[PDB]
């Protein structure tokens, strides 16, 4: 059957600024870069950046809620978020509707998130503060 | 420091067909559902389906190359691809790279992939046959 995300591929309009964002600003590990892409890792995540002439720099009001959240510890969360803010990284959401999260945009407007906590922890939190109509299986 | 992918959230136009697709067709585990979304798991992947009236059912020619690949073993790949074909799931690309890949669309046009092979396998193949402009770190 299916087991896990094998990789996340993000289309990017300008390869070098996107590599710099994920590697320098977010601290991911850069493994390889070529004329039309790059491979990075973030823990066990394989991230591919793919140069795509069709990728548009998209304001967050023009895209849907699809987004990619990266894990960070409770001890590191606030200083990492504050560093992104001080660096001028654009945001897209403020209301913490799914726990301790910071919502920010990549250079092309991909919707990203820093989040503290696992699915199990979110389910436990939701039992006390459930989403409207929530059922647990 | 970021330690991995925390969750993938897909905006969906209709929650019921999206739950059927990810849970019943793709075999992911449904943990919770509420009026406007659902939480599933696929191995270590935490998947959130978020009901979003801004989600358009998007033909593949009208979206960029951003896509989400799920891991499957080589032994299971062909029968899973056949299952998707029997279900009438559209393909958006043919495989021309190393490692088996099946490129298929979700009900809203999210670009998905089944892939066999890790980042390490891809890097080993690339070292033997580097892409144009390829540099390793
Ligand atoms: C022309 C040029 O400067 N290319 C270049 C710069 C930095 C990196 C990391 C790479 Cl692979 C290539
Ligand atoms: Mn999220
Ligand atoms: Mn892929």
Residue numbers in the entry:
A (entry chain A), B (entry chain B): 1 to 137
Which statements did the authors publish about this structure?
For comparison, the same screen was conducted with conventional single crystal data collection at cryogenic temperatures (100 K) from loop-mounted crystals at beamline P11 at PETRA III. In total, 7 fragments bind in the two RT screens, of which 3 bind to pharmaceutically relevant sites 1, 2 and 4. In contrast, 31 fragments are observed binding in the cryo screens, but only 6 of these bind to the more interesting sites 1-4.
Here we systematically compare RT fragment screening of the Fosfomycin-resistance protein A from Klebsiella pneumoniae (FosAKP), an enzyme involved in antibiotic resistance, with conventional single crystal data collection at cryogenic temperature (cryo). Fosfomycin, a broad-spectrum antibiotic, is routinely used to treat urinary infections. However, natural resistance can exist in gram-negative bacteria, mainly through the enzyme Fosfomycin-resistance protein A (FosA), that catalyzes the Mn2+ and K+-dependent glutathione mediated inactivation of Fosfomycin. Therefore, increased interest exists to identify inhibitors of FosA to enable the use of Fosfomycin to also treat resistant strains24.
